[model samples]
Target: DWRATLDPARKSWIETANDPACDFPIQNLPFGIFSDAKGARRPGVALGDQIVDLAALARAGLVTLPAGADVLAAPTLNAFIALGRDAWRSVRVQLSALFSRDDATLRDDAALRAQVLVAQRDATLHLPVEIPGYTDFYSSKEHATNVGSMFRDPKNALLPNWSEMPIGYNGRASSVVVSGTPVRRPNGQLKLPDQERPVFGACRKLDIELETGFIVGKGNALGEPIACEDAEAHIFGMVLLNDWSARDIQQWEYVPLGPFNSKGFATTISPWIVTLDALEPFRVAQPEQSPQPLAYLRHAGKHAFDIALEVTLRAEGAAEATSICRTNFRHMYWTMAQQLAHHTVAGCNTRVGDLMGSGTISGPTKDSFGSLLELTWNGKEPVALNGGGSRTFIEDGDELTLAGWCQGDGYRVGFGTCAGRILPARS
Candidate 1:
């Protein structure tokens, strides 16, 4: 939508060419913060090959903020976003104008162009904001059913409450890291099939959860619960997420409680946050729910996004990676708004920088499965990769990557890949 009026001359420079994700070029300028070689962290915008340095704009006094805002001076974007919804919307509009093809304000300013756009490979990206809290939700029906069948009867696949509402659990915000970090397999409780007792050991059945996370731009008060109808106002943006799992450890301890050892090990999120405004064009109707939800969980309008998501796995010492699975966000049973609304239903106060993850977005097809839990049907069948290699569960030293992007009319919007490689656990 934003690129429809863009001139062909400028399109050649900003367009990701034919790339389905990159071409929706201007709409996909997700924001983040990064440090150059000198290690000074400040706000930046992601582009095809570079990061548009907001600090550079601030230094030149070329940047302006809405009233009650000081985002340019902050090291991270948390404080800026916490200022409020109006501030967030204002900044988005302003930034969009600066980058819009028709807007020649920044383009004509040669000095500003040189100061803003910095090569992506030349800078180290930090976590975009200070995440105050993190919550991961199981909102995909296919993913839940697949995993449930492994430990339970196929006839009784989904749990009773699975169709009712979004099920979620609090996660460790301290363990959340940016993409490309090496994740060490965590030591946790595990139970063997034949063994009478459980044991604590390094994770043997390591796996990955394909997910997308949303950042909070606005928060609710301690006693205030967000209405489902207005929940989108609280959302800031989305990021590719990899929720690493230790399946063996999770199985023994996750009976009463959903997941503890299986999760909480390490979660990876893409540095760039694709704003909700940018993804507006990709909105689509979510899959229908079987049982009607309570009035609180019901809302109208297109809730789910149509972003295409994929995962790639590379073995240790391998030169090439193989595409393991494909899925879309449209498969989510509950919308992000519904999840957020349900989270705050009980007077739980959410913070401006808190992160919420849409857990394991899987489609109906076997090829579109999201996690190893479903892709291999709980290790019953191993997946064949291109180079004659096969895998059921992730082995030590394997690397997993998650990527997402939306294909729009004549343009594309995407989150650069979020990836993590497994490292051997401590002996």
Candidate 2:
């Protein structure tokens, strides 16, 4: 693991990153797009309580990126990451050296500081990239077993094809959104056991799925395959993801084919894109596979990260939030490398901003269930909340928040919250 980025003595001259609870420390120089009171978006880097306007710094002659197409002024991060891995590492090195405690250039010059650093409170953060392709994977063994046993017989908890490979489905990239976006209740066909027929109406069984989303950086040409070991090179970074779902809608439509509009309505991601390089310290070995992976799914290095993940519920006009579930990213049955390798094994083309989701990260315990459908036992058990209330599934005007972080010895590397509210159906 890279120790320089994890150095405890490394404090930024800017002073805000030194806060013990801050998500944007000098250790995590994550990238995103932001705009000042001006609505125009510009590439920005998050460090502590401010945003580093990369375009302004490049234009002000404070930093010089490697020779390539200019992405600092571009509206999206797809261009910056499209420059490939070397350029990505180059920017990290430059940013670290420039903001190190000894560097006096950025902090000393008042005019340069004013032009470069924008107060975080005064800026608006947008989706880190314009995703061209999106895929979701069912990588949690515990989640799979729970859902299977509830919906099927206990003897055959897992499907016949479960152990063979990583199961996934191409998702709707157009419906993907960033944090703070409001999700409207979807109207679709749903048939209950007691009902004689199905009907189209607003979904009564709205739910939240806790997961991690990876952003693709460099991609291969068509007819080329990505090795399992080389998957990280194509992966740019990760963000907290919430794949909102309508359980009733999914149950009726996902029989012959996989999930359709039910699972694709709105997928929310965190604002900052935490680079994989910064997450090096948290790498862990994956759980052993029983059947052993095929040739393509094997990898050489540790493929899991020890990030603590949990979800909370906030009811409308509520005084406090309730911690409903807790889990970790390291519990997945398959790794990101395995998923990416299998994705393009047939020589399918991928793009720079392709997104992949680690479907519902559940653990062995009942408390670690990732979705309400599992946590509530298909609406049989209700979870108690803080205000003497309970929930079987989400309600209108309820807000769900997903938070994750990797705890280091003295500090933590975190992904700011991914959150969304449930709005009333469109009339």
Candidate 3:
């Protein structure tokens, strides 16, 4: 009721939902736990949305502190977020009030908004925290075809099994970090065109994967397959993820097994975790599949989120960044429910904070490609940057960022930002 009376005409973070800043607007309040300059971690809500310094609120006794107060006092949300869904929900509802339009208690309090709403530009965002495990899946038919054509004949672009189910591999959870972290080029085995044998060195071709990652709030034990119908219950929320790739390493080492060194280098995620409940309006059906999936991967309502995704690249020495590719989540071949259902079918245990990434989500057009491999045609054609440079593959110091959001009637939903800058590999 309070949200209804809040002046639709008011110029607050919530009203910015229809404006240019809608991605982080107040109505689209995403959540994250963070530590302040004093090193005390606390749960914060995102509003314009900027980092609402929750720790600052607790220090001022604004809201009731949760059970894991000490955990919230840490530098990251890993420990506090692990407190589970009940606590997460409680914090969300409590924070929602401070900005409610009809709630005059804190609406006109300029000092409270200033203390509570930390400008996104001024905030140093850390990863939203708890991520027990990470599973990266290939779910985009367009991206697959684009990359497959470069290696295989045009008629046989996709692998035979690609159309059957969502293909994925477990990723290193320990290596995942918050946006803005510099990803060092990884050292790995490479097989050049002329060389018959493989050699090890810093990666020559670094790339970025535009994707979305969902977080698990509730999990099941090993040996129990989560039914597709109930898969949404296990999911907590979603975030923007950039799975950086070392193409040279992936090309050489991915012969027998899936990616190892090429992927383990670094995967960046946005600081805020946008909850599934918040994204209800953007749900959409998965793209039509050619060969219907087996019963296990099929569910009546399973599919993708209707989120718009984009990738931008800034050259190491360039003054401005360029928007290289744009795409949408509706292009995914399989739905999140199916992916989760298949993951646990074999009885593999999933944890509460595990993350599942929807692989490169490229659309059907050249400009809508998702990865550098597609955007550059495997280094055959370099993409022109805005200022005066071009990039076939990422150069050292090149920063890649992924952003996504869904717009709806009078409101918008968004994933903050997943960004990483490349750094030279250690000698």
Which prediction has more favorable TM-score, 1 or 3?
Answer: 1
Better of 2 and 3 by lDDT: 2
The total number of steric clashes, by the backbone 3 Å criterion, in model 2 comes to 0
Global CA lDDT computed for model 1: 0.82
Which 10 consecutive positions of candidate 2 have the poorest summed lDDT? 1-10
Pairs in steric clash, model 1: 23-412, 24-411, 24-412
Cα shift from native, residue 278, model 1 (Å): 0.3
How far out, in Å, is residue 218 in model 1? 0.6
lDDT of each: 0.82, 0.88, 0.78
- lDDT by residue (239-344, candidate 3, tens digit) is 9988988999998888678888899889998878888766766778777788887887778863568888889998777787899888888778888888899899
Per-residue lDDT of candidate 1, residues 140-216 (tens digit)? 98888988787689889898898888999998898899998999988887888789998888887889999999999
The residue ranges of model 2 lying beyond 4 angstroms of the native Cα positions read 1-3
